Design a protein around this nucleic acid. Sequence first.
DNA 1: GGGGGAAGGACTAA
DNA 2: TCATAGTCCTTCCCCC
Length: 341
Amino acid sequence: MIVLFVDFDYFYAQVEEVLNPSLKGKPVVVCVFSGRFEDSGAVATANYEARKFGVKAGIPIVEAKKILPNAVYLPMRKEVYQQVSSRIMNLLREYSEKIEIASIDEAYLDISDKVRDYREAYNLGLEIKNKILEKEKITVTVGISKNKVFAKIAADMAKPNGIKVIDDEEVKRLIRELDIADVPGIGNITAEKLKKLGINKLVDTLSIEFDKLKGMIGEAKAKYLISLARDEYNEPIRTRVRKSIGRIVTMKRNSRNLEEIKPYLFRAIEESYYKLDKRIPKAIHVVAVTEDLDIVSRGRTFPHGISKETAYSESVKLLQKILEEDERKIRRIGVRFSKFI
DNA sequence: GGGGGAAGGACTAA
DNA sequence: TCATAGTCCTTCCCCC
Ligand SMILES: [Mg+2]
Ligand SMILES: [Mg+2]
């Protein structure tokens, strides 16, 4: 299997550039303004001009302004980025029916039946970068290898505006050298549990007692890491099916007053159903972001489709169940639907 | 012993 | 006042 992975570069920021060419060269910061106070919120992303100085996805807009008070700050326009994204995905289908859209800016193409070696793949990668730059003036990084995971690692190494192949020999090389924390699926919490076992390279997972690793990081991740170690991982590229759709919204001020949170809850439902678009969910969950940031969630599954009417009354029950089972004030409130028919 | 689903918190990522 | 969507893992639970 020859997988080709595509990841758009500093996407939201780059799209803002394409719609306003005069931003080219200046640090650009796309923000999610929460609204409780001027400059409240986080950075969704930044171009490399801004990123070069420490301004990057996740930090408070406040900080970014202290680092680069003169960078361009723009409100995130997801709808716009999503349409640009869809158009790019379509260009990708012209290269393989077997395509997996991982996120708004990531996709895997199984090009096994399109090329015969990593040389042709590489050229096809170039064709793709030029096609996109051409049609949408968007630069992307291409990663090529024998499976989804390494194709993604290839990309991580070559970004931005790059392209890299990781042949079988380099795979085995990485299995021993590559820092295990840089493996897709391994987060901080998991990276830590691993270090606490001397495990710092994939190979180290082959020498350790399984049940020992399993009891530490869970059975699924254990099998995942090992299979990668044995150079055996090869999950198929498959059309993705969003299993759930929801929306969570931050409130002006925290509280635990049902009637004061209702507005937000309902606003979150209207926005969600909209997104549902044709989909009828059989399950629903009300999600809460406590003052301390912990997450409290209570949901329920029904034996049939959920009407917006139901969603309404039902969400209030779940909301209160949360209210009674947690004495914390709520910072953000949202809803989430799943188990579509 | 395990198929299978429902619920709640974990974990990645974003 | 710093703090922005989704997928699974783990557990209990009915039950063949
Ligand atoms: Mg990405
Ligand atoms: Mg990207």
